[PDB]
Amino acid sequence: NIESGIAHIRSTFNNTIVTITDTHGNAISWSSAGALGFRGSRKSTPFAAQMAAETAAKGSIEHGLKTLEVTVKGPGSGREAAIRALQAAGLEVTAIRDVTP
Amino acid sequence: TQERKNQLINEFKTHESDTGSPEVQIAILTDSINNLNEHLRTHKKDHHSRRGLLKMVGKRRNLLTYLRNKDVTRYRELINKLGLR
Amino acid sequence: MRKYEVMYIIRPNIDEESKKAVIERFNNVLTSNGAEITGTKDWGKRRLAYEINDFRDGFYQIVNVQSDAAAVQEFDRLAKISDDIIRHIVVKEEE
Amino acid sequence: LIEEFMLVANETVAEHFHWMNVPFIYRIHEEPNAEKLQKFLEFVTTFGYVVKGTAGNIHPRALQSILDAVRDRPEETVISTVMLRSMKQAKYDPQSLGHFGLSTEFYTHFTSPIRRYPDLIVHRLIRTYLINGKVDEATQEKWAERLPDIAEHTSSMERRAVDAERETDDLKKAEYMLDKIGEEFDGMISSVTNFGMFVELPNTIEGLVHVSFMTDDYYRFDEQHFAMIGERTGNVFRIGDEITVKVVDVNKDERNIDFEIVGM
Amino acid sequence: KVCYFTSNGITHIDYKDVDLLKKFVSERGKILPRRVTGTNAKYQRKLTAAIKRARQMALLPYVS
RNA sequence: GAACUUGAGUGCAGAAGAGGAGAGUGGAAUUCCACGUGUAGCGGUGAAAUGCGUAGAGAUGUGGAGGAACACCAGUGGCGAAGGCGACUCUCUGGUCUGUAACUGACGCUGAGGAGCGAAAGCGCGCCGUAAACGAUGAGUGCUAAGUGUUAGGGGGUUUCCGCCCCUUAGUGCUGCAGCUAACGCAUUAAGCACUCCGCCUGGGGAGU
RNA sequence: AAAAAAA
């Protein structure tokens, strides 16, 4: 049971993972386009991004999260939708970060 | 430093307003050379500094040579006082 | 000697008494090594832009001094060692 | 100055008649389209902003807080333009539904009855309800029957007027520039469609630049990052960029103006 | 497009003035180019040292 | 022999710089691993195979490989003799530019040989040290239309500084006369017109043998 | 392609 946390979205060209953690980086929950049953083209899409983002977000709200810091990696098209999806799930987003090298 | 430079000028000037005499110039150069030789003793691999030195030494030598042909007395006085060969 | 501006961040998890001890210690370090303190501001607890040694805030001090390298370099040496001063920066003032 | 006075007058009249609970005409502005706004909120996340709101229920203040932040930046014209593309239109209506753009729940037009029929109606309703004191049920039922048709008609006539005024502006804008052939101008990239590029000159005159005139490279429209991406030369033409352009084809009849990429 | 530093008679930018420097970074933290802030090259360089000195002492953030 | 100040240099004032050697420190990546949580896919994708893994992977946090570099700024911008030189701070240190002329009074230029610096080399920090180590153009000096941009200064103008205009020094670009050129081109950063000194060439192979 | 508001 924790309130504040980070959401590490990895949107690649092939897949969207979404982990959510605490401030110490311990995984609270996660979901992904592949674990959403999307396959091939669909895993790349921003539809599958929001699906995974919300699937893990709603998993985090069970543990009782409210505020998320986001961190993004990878060049995929999913970050845009996924981050809105964290706001649309209910969780308020503060600091955005794009940690893409 | 500028205070050192101000001592040196007063010590070696050939009249009151003189800063442009070889005596003066060589004195100043002599100090800069001794300070930079010291710099290079610690920082051996500081090549770009060494190039600067080599030009300073050159500037010295040309002034001394200049002095030597102008007035040999002044030339002797100056090399003794500074401690050059 | 030449003007410097010594700015450091004391960790946010200390008492004001312990804080004053740090300032006095480090102002003593500088003056002991032949510095003279012209100024000593205190910005107070500010939020850091990022997390330093797992602290999200810290007590900014800002000491103007006039000294030789030895003073500043001694401050630098001890400010590294000290676990109270989490970060610092010496800077020359450009006249 | 005059804007603010007319606004407070209009709000005060609208508020009074809301609390009177009689049939009245209002000037409403709905909340923005949730799909278009969704694309806007994504778009402003490309730059690292976070808007404290959802696409269903965004507060006007949140959209102002973006507009303030971007002031004097490379993300100023871009954001502002995509915020408009998510905005709607205002219309008259008998129901007090609020004015999103002015962030007030009570708005009507009272202050221009020479030139707006809904202002002449408000004046008659003021004379009916306040001056004559006629707040009987039969008077209300008569106005309640008449106002919806007036509101819908007048809102249609406003849109028709604005479209016509713009059409004539764009028409005479070409007429002005039937001698600008060749003359280069330093005007910003105002829009990037897939069929070319649209460049506003400082004086609010826009013109087109197809890949037909993007002669150097085979550019491509990145929707997510609102921009033109060339590959053969490796170029980048985002929106809001200060660039140079030349008038080639002012065809007045269709109200076309064309540019060419002089450069950036 | 004017140089803020020339315009307002400023000769020395200070890495301690956080809100002054803040006008010359993006939200992520990226130093905004001369072409967009209209700064003079002289000051752009003074500005950039200051921003980096700021960043070191956690007055400003690092990029994205 | 004497005299001189314009070349050269010293003062004095100011200026800019990723110039050099030290020595600390910053954020980051990167990812060998050890382990903290977590738990089913991670994927590669023409999209599938190809891999793979629950014995906990991916994603994820701190020891940590700790060795490398410094995203924005960043500019055919700056500095350097060249090769080069870009996080921040301090320490030590080299050169250049502008202004004033207080001083010296030709102290200057070039420079075989020599010495030093000097890539991936090539190879045991050492040697090696040849090098599209080719803006394909030696150094120094003076002279010979313009126009325009940019970097670091100076003088002036109105004008409150700013701003905007004029003049000027040094650098760095673009365009362009005269002249030069086989042509292409170069053109006050000359490949023009001159003088000093150095390096170098004399058909292609054979042969850099 | 084009928001309020004003004309």
Tab-separated table of N, CA and C (backbone and C1' of nucleotides) in Angstrom, chain F residues 17 19 74 78 114:
chain	number	residue	atom	x	y	z
F	17	G	P	34.472	34.272	-23.873
F	17	G	O5'	35.482	33.355	-24.696
F	17	G	C5'	35.123	32.881	-26.003
F	17	G	C4'	36.294	32.121	-26.575
F	17	G	C3'	36.837	30.995	-25.705
F	17	G	O3'	36.085	29.804	-25.839
F	17	G	C1'	38.624	32.248	-26.525
F	19	G	P	39.617	27.231	-25.771
F	19	G	O5'	40.739	26.115	-25.915
F	19	G	C5'	41.229	25.787	-27.243
F	19	G	C4'	42.732	25.841	-27.278
F	19	G	C3'	43.449	24.978	-26.250
F	19	G	O3'	43.335	23.585	-26.529
F	19	G	C1'	44.498	27.054	-26.366
F	74	A	P	24.234	28.349	-29.362
F	74	A	O5'	24.927	27.146	-30.155
F	74	A	C5'	24.832	27.098	-31.597
F	74	A	C4'	25.408	25.806	-32.107
F	74	A	C3'	24.510	24.562	-32.015
F	74	A	O3'	24.648	23.685	-33.119
F	74	A	C1'	26.554	24.169	-30.860
F	78	G	P	34.969	32.381	-35.885
F	78	G	O5'	35.212	32.007	-34.358
F	78	G	C5'	34.937	32.993	-33.348
F	78	G	C4'	35.486	32.481	-32.046
F	78	G	C3'	36.970	32.118	-32.067
F	78	G	O3'	37.767	33.259	-31.800
F	78	G	C1'	35.749	30.364	-31.087
F	114	G	P	69.633	17.221	-39.908
F	114	G	O5'	69.785	18.108	-38.580
F	114	G	C5'	70.995	18.030	-37.787
F	114	G	C4'	70.845	18.876	-36.541
F	114	G	C3'	69.698	18.484	-35.600
F	114	G	O3'	70.057	17.437	-34.709
F	114	G	C1'	69.632	20.818	-36.011
